Design a protein around this ligand. Sequence first.
Ligand SMILES: O=C1C=C(O)C[C@@H](C=C2c3ccccc3-c3ccccc32)O1
Length: 134
Amino acid sequence: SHMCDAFVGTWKLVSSENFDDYMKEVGVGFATRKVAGMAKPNMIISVNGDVITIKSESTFKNTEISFILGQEFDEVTADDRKVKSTITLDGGVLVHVQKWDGKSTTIKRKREDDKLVVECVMKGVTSTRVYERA
Ligand SMILES: O=C1C=C(O)C[C@@H](C=C2c3ccccc3-c3ccccc32)O1
């Protein structure tokens, strides 16, 4: 048993708060915000050795990242940013920093009760996305 056991699984989005405003702060344009904001993604997390894979599947976009903790990688975000990402574990929280165009956003993912809570932060703006097991 191991580092991210409690994250592993298939998860479905059940609530979202302030996501439009988070996307605005990120720089997402109107049409992508409207369509992206409707999506109810399935997040599929798995671990094979040191490699963590997070897939997100929705009607808007399918994304996939695989990574080793602490080791920077290239990511294509759902809104089509090309970012440099680094994901670490801090006290049981996955902390994902994305850098692009001189900007930065942090996504934290944590287990809380039977949920997986995703907090997306851009400057002063937070969005909270709550997932339950599918
Ligand atoms: O791990 C997670 C789980 C979440 O529910 C949001 C997701 C991040 C994004 C995101 C970030 C910035 C701009 C757009 C989008 C977007 C648009 C559609 C679906 C998902 C996402 O990151």
